[PDB]
Amino acid sequence: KELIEYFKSQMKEDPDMASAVAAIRTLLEFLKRDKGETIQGLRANLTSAIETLCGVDSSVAVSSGGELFLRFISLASLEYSDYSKCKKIMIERGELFLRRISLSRNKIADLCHTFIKDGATILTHAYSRVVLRVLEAAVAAKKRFSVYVTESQPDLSGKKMAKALCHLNVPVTVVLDAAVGYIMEKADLVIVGAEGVVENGGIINKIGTNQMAVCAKAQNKPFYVVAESFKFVRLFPLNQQDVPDKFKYHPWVDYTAPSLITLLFTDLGVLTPSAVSDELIKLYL
Amino acid sequence: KELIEYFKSQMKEDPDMASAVAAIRTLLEFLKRDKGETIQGLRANLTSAIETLCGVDSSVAVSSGGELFLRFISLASLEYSDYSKCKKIMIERGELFLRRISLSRNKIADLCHTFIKDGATILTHAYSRVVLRVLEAAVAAKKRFSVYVTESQPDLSGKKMAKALCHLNVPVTVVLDAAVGYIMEKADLVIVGAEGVVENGGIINKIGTNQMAVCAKAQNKPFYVVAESFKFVRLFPLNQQDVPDKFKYHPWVDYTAPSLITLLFTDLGVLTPSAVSDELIKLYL
Amino acid sequence: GSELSERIESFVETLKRGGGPRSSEEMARETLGLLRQIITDHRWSNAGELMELIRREGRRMTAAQPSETTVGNMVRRVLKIIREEYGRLHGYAQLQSNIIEAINELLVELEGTMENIAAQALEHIHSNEVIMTIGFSRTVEAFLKEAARKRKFHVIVAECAPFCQGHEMAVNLSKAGIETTVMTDAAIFAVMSRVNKVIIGTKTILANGALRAVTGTHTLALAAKHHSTPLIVCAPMFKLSPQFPNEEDSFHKFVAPEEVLPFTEGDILEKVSVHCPVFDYVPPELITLFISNIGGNAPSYIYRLMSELYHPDDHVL
């Protein structure tokens, strides 16, 4: 399996690199290495590629990025009638789309860090590069604030987030993961990074998020959720079992109601949670 | 310091024994060993005893039991004018009060386990003998239910609770402490053991409780709190810092709003949370 | 020429000194007339040069008064109209008359806004109804004074403490006979137990569905959310702004504290700190429905009107 080897080579060469962009690069490399002049023959190969990428990596962003890439392949196949020019069209359009995606995080940082007040308190969850990029743009914009990061028990990455913030020389504190309701009254805003956004406006994240969301609901705190556009999922989980069980495995994913979410911070801008369904219905899976 | 030595000898000889009853036994032994014919001379000695018991043990139930014992000493001093008969009156009344207190847990079990349905799901917090006594009376009353116990990260005692329930041969599962909002929709009732009850109806417990309480509020689940009568505290914490800081030391105590609590299960019976203030105002500290 | 800069500076210090004119639809007509005078009195080869020009004078006009967003969003709407015409002509010399006729279409759209809200006003009022409003706005009083032509109901106009402008709304609605009740601003939750729905106006709709309005209406929105009564925001589409709430803390407009605490209070005015914010912030979760001239919209739909009327490249202006 050269696809999983190329995916692990793209994901392990950079620790600042997400899993979804590595999966999209692996899918583009597999489409460039396919050279099969068939629409359904390429669609079945892409579906087996996303099957391998979901059997290997249990992340939601990998399958999300593969579904967006499959919708992009379907749009490029429905646009051009002949396949010979359509192969080069898919290659150039996918390379330009990956170039647009690789600059997305900086766009989130300059368009997101404007909201954070000076002299305030930030409550944040486990390790991701997006909230570090937003916070380093905030401290590059000459802002001072106190940071409380969840320890995030199943893999101690919030302590790694705190180490990365102490190397940034900012006041950060590892707070107990059973104490997100203890420090909610002092946290005037709760900004969190997500790994997958479902259609109605809710999010798919790490297990300690949703309870914090209802701590943001009873205590009236603005629960800000930060995520890019390739994490948009065409699913509707109703209850906590209604997420797909292959992404769970002690649960690993909690569904957060869209009423508990104040704003989203995507590449389209600062959006209401109802905007994700707009993008997902003009995208049509 | 013979008082702390007697307290540790009473608390370490029985693992089924609480800290508050050991503190009341230590206070009764110190009152029997005082032999000082003075009202204020005994009150200052008792206050220094509770000062030592609060400097040694940072539990809220120890200081609560000492304040109830001090109010009992004040009532017995205000009742009898002469101190010579009042010393034996205090000794006999304290021995009879300790005999009444030592049978309290069984009373909680037979008067509390009636509420738990058959074929239901229990959500429970960290290790205490009271919820084990209630659950063993429930399985002695021929009831079957599935138990989800919080792992309770700062001292892994919920796993010890689960081991004590697997030795009882009941279906119990260690659930992630960041997943108390994940399994709230399947938990039709949430029964929890507390270590201290403040005056309005709220409780003082271990740090992972209060967030679960608001998970019981947004998801309409009946949040049952189980505690005896010697855990009644004459305090009013408004915010999470308004608890006394000597009982905190990563926080260890969360204050739970009385609106998030459905019922209490004390030695007076199944009570509304407004009953604790009634008992605390006819007790008068 | 020179007369253009005369009129521009007169508009700038008119916005700087006070409210000139009084209501907002005349101000939007003045802004569109000033913008058509700017595009008819200049010379350009590319549309981007006029775009940079309009961005500079929009920066100047919003630096005159940062609290009033109508001039800024009108400049941004004219910028998106120019961008749409350049995009539809790019895929050259006929651009200027196209922007002129587009500004004329926007003027015909803008003059018939309040009467379109009045035409769709009958779809929200039933017989023997208790209505509570705040402040003073000619859209809401026109709404109620023509909705009382076929229905009979009750309007409770609550005054606002900095400038009791609801007395004018009360004496304007009482001439139409809608059984107007006049109250203070402190009895809202005292009367929220009987108010069936809340029909208010606003000053500026934000990008996330939130709104700034006359002060004390966030309390009214909280009480109406507590009592679960629907909120009707009768607002036009020139009060729609892409400015986010948390942006350089320039939200509230503070005025002189004489109307709160007079100058004849004594020597105690030295050791006191009196603030008078005339505007207030309402989040979109405390709002049920917006009523614009094109119909009723959700607070979960303000982003679509934002992307349909404004461009994300012009948010900095």
From Swiss-Prot, chains A, B:
Q: What is the lineage of its organism?
A: Eukaryota, Metazoa, Chordata, Craniata, Vertebrata
What's the main place this protein lives? cytoplasm
How's its activity regulated?
A: Activated by the chemical integrated stress response (ISR) inhibitor ISRIB which stimulates guanine nucleotide exchange factor activity for both phosphorylated and unphosphorylated eIF2.
What GO CC terms are in its UniProt record?
cytoplasm; cytosol; eukaryotic translation initiation factor 2B complex; membrane; plasma membrane
Swiss-Prot/TrEMBL GO biological process terms: cytoplasmic translational initiation; oligodendrocyte development; response to glucose; response to heat; response to peptide hormone; T cell receptor signaling pathway; translational initiation
Report the family membership.
Answer: Belongs to the eIF-2B alpha/beta/delta subunits family.
Q: Which domain of life is it from?
A: Eukaryota
Q: Name one GO molecular function term.
A: identical protein binding
Cell compartments where the protein resides: Cytoplasm, Cytosol
Tell me what gene encodes this. Answer: EIF2B1
Which pathological condition is tied to this protein?
Answer: Leukoencephalopathy with vanishing white matter 1: An autosomal recessive brain disease characterized by neurological features including progressive cerebellar ataxia, spasticity, and cognitive deficits. Brain imaging shows abnormal white matter that vanishes over time and is replaced by cerebrospinal fluid. Disease severity ranges from fatal infantile forms to adult forms without neurological deterioration. The disease is progressive with, in most individuals, additional episodes of rapid deterioration following febrile infections or minor head trauma.
- One Pfam family matching this protein: IF-2B
| Alphabetized SUPFAM superfamilies for the sequence | NagB/RpiA/CoA transferase-like
Task: List the keywords (alphabetical).
Answer: Acetylation, Cytoplasm, Disease variant, Initiation factor, Leukodystrophy, Protein biosynthesis
The molecule here is called Translation initiation factor eIF2B subunit alpha
InterPro entries, sorted: eIF2B_alpha/beta/delta, elF-2B_alpha_N, IF-2B-related, IF_2B-like_C, NagB/RpiA_transferase-like
UniProt-listed PANTHER family: TRANSLATION INITIATION FACTOR EIF-2B SUBUNIT ALPHA (PTHR45860:SF1)
Role of this protein: Acts as a component of the translation initiation factor 2B (eIF2B) complex, which catalyzes the exchange of GDP for GTP on eukaryotic initiation factor 2 (eIF2) gamma subunit. Its guanine nucleotide exchange factor activity is repressed when bound to eIF2 complex phosphorylated on the alpha subunit, thereby limiting the amount of methionyl-initiator methionine tRNA available to the ribosome and consequently global translation is repressed.
The subunit structure is: Component of the translation initiation factor 2B (eIF2B) complex which is a heterodecamer of two sets of five different subunits: alpha, beta, gamma, delta and epsilon. Subunits alpha, beta and delta comprise a regulatory subcomplex and subunits epsilon and gamma comprise a catalytic subcomplex. Within the complex, the hexameric regulatory complex resides at the center, with the two heterodimeric catalytic subcomplexes bound on opposite sides.
Give the sites modified to N6-acetyllysine: 32
Curated annotation (Swiss-Prot), chain C:
Q: Which GO terms describe its biological process?
A: central nervous system development; cytoplasmic translational initiation; myelination; oligodendrocyte development; ovarian follicle development; regulation of translational initiation; response to glucose; response to heat
Q: Looking at the record's lineage, which domain of life comes first? A: Eukaryota
Note whether Cell cycle occurs among the keywords: no
Where found? Answer: Cytoplasm, Cytosol
Q: Which InterPro entries match?
A: eIF2B_beta_subunit, IF-2B-related, IF_2B-like_C, NagB/RpiA_transferase-like
- Gene3D superfamilies, alphabetized: Translation initiation factor eif-2b, domain 2 (3.40.50.10470)
UniProt xrefs under Pfam families: IF-2B
- Effect of altering residue 179 to G? In VWM2; with and without ovarian failure
Pathology linked to this chain's protein: Leukoencephalopathy with vanishing white matter 2: An autosomal recessive brain disease characterized by neurological features including progressive cerebellar ataxia, spasticity, and cognitive deficits. Brain imaging shows abnormal white matter that vanishes over time and is replaced by cerebrospinal fluid. Disease severity ranges from fatal infantile forms to adult forms without neurological deterioration. The disease is progressive with, in most individuals, additional episodes of rapid deterioration following febrile infections or minor head trauma.
The molecule here is called Translation initiation factor eIF2B subunit beta
